[PDB]
């Protein structure tokens, strides 16, 4: 059995850590809700 615990407020934080890139990817979505890389 599963339960929930509160972790925070949903707010934008000025001077959050900024990272990650922005790839443009072709993907397929199957009936199971799984993305796969088309190439």
């Amino acid at each position: 059995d599963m339960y929930i615990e509160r972790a925070g407020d949903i707010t934008w934080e000025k001077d959050a850590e900024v990272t990650g890139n922005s790839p443009r990817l072709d993907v397929a979505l199957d009936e199971s809700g799984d993305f796969s890389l088309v190439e």
């Binding site: 929930i4 925070g8 900024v18 922005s22 790839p23 990817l25 072709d26 809700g33 993305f35 890389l37």
Partner: protein, 156 residues
């Protein structure tokens, strides 16, 4: 139960100790998470119970106690923040410019950020603080790095 708005952990005792299987969003009295986190099972909140109300395995989403409430969308231009809630670590905002998933059905924003599996369901925010989607359904790229869709449902 704790009906208060904000981000929450999703825990089970069914594995070793207390394991975080993912995250969700409480808004207007409705809990929002990804389908693969709960597989549509009921949740406990103190004494309070949470029963599934809506879900779809293909969108990989589920809502509890009422219909899906989150309707904000990425403008396709601005940076956003993943409000990441990793297992056993504090909620931590990360800012990024989304990439793109191009599909036969149109285009979705994607966030290229690596986190443990139990982070599935962490909310993605716009500059006004509105939830534009949940993190943790996506793909693994050439690098071996993860790219998540910005997964969002519909409001009636």
């Amino acid at each position: 139960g704790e009906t208060t708005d904000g981000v929450y952990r999703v825990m089970t005792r069914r594995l070793l100790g207390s394991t975080q299987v993912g995250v969700g969003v409480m808004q207007e009295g409705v809990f929002h998470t990804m389908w693969h986190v709960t597989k549509g099972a009921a949740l406990r909140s103190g004494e309070g119970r949470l029963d599934p109300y809506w879900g779809d395995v293909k969108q990989d989403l589920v809502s509890y106690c009422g219909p899906w409430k989150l309707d904000a969308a990425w403008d396709g231009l601005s940076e956003v923040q993943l409000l990441a809630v990793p297992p056993g670590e504090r909620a931590k905002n990360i800012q990024t410019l989304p990439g793109i998933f191009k599909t036969k059905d149109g285009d979705i924003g994607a966030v290229a950020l690596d986190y443990p599996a139990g982070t599935s369901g962490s909310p993605i925010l716009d500059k006004c603080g509105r939830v534009i989607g949940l993190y943790g359904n996506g793909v693994v790229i050439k690098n071996g790095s993860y790219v998540s869709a910005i997964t969002q449902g519909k409001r009636e």
